[PDB]
Amino acid sequence: PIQDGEFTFLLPAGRKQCFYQSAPANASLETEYQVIGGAGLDVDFTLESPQGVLLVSESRKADGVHTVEPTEAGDYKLCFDNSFSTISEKLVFFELIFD
Amino acid sequence: PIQDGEFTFLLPAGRKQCFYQSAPANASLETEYQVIGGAGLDVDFTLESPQGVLLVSESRKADGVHTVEPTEAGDYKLCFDNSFSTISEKLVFFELIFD
């Protein structure tokens, strides 16, 4: 594992939060997210490539694991969408990059 | 708090990591970071307003604490720049919004 991260955040009612993760070309990007506790239960998750290709789109999931291999050089975008929710949601995501 | 986040990540040599933090108007954005390890390990940090005003810009820091108050409505941009270094560095970053 050459790069790793843990991101824990409150996602307010009705809002979206994205993260920009730089990757080198020809690596493996491993990602895992989890809604914490019960509150909000689930989330809409998207993963976009550095060239803006939608790689993952899932609706109303509590958790998910997604690996990009091989990666292209640039910024991957991980987005969490809490649109229509009147309550905040606590999320954690993990990302690992392997040569 | 109305919103909190704690981010731990490896920032490789020659890379920059930016975070976007949504704030409502007339709130308090409190931020704190730490580079993990002994002496000689540091990072450049910038904090930009939603309209792109440079609010913080500091070079080769191991740590920093910054409050924006009052906030405007929009996404603050918080960047850790390791672009001018051969050493990867491990960062902890905290953000908090109070109404």
Swiss-Prot record, chains A, B:
Q: How does it assemble?
A: Homodimer in endoplasmic reticulum, endoplasmic reticulum-Golgi intermediate compartment and cis-Golgi network. Interacts with IL1RL1. Interacts with RNF26; this interaction is important to modulate innate immune signaling through the cGAS-STING pathway.
Role noted for this protein: Potential role in vesicular protein trafficking, mainly in the early secretory pathway. May act as a cargo receptor at the lumenal side for incorporation of secretory cargo molecules into transport vesicles and may be involved in vesicle coat formation at the cytoplasmic side. Plays a positive role in IL-33-mediated IL-8 and IL-6 production by interacting with interleukin-33 receptor IL1RL1. Also plays a role in the modulation of innate immune signaling through the cGAS-STING pathway by interacting with RNF26.
Source taxonomy lineage? Eukaryota, Metazoa, Chordata, Craniata, Vertebrata
Domain of life assignment = Eukaryota
State which stretch of the full-length protein is shown: 28 to 126 of 227
Q: Where in the cell is it found?
A: Cell membrane; Endoplasmic reticulum membrane; Golgi apparatus, cis-Golgi network membrane; Endoplasmic reticulum-Golgi intermediate compartment membrane
Q: In which tissues is it expressed?
A: Widely expressed.
Any additional notes? Answer: Found only in very low concentrations in the endoplasmic reticulum, Golgi apparatus and endoplasmic reticulum-Golgi intermediate compartment compared to other members of the EMP24/GP25L family.
- Every GOLD domain range: 16-98
**Species for this entry:** Homo sapiens (Human)
Q: What is this protein called?
A: Transmembrane emp24 domain-containing protein 1
Q: Which family does it belong to?
A: Belongs to the EMP24/GP25L family.
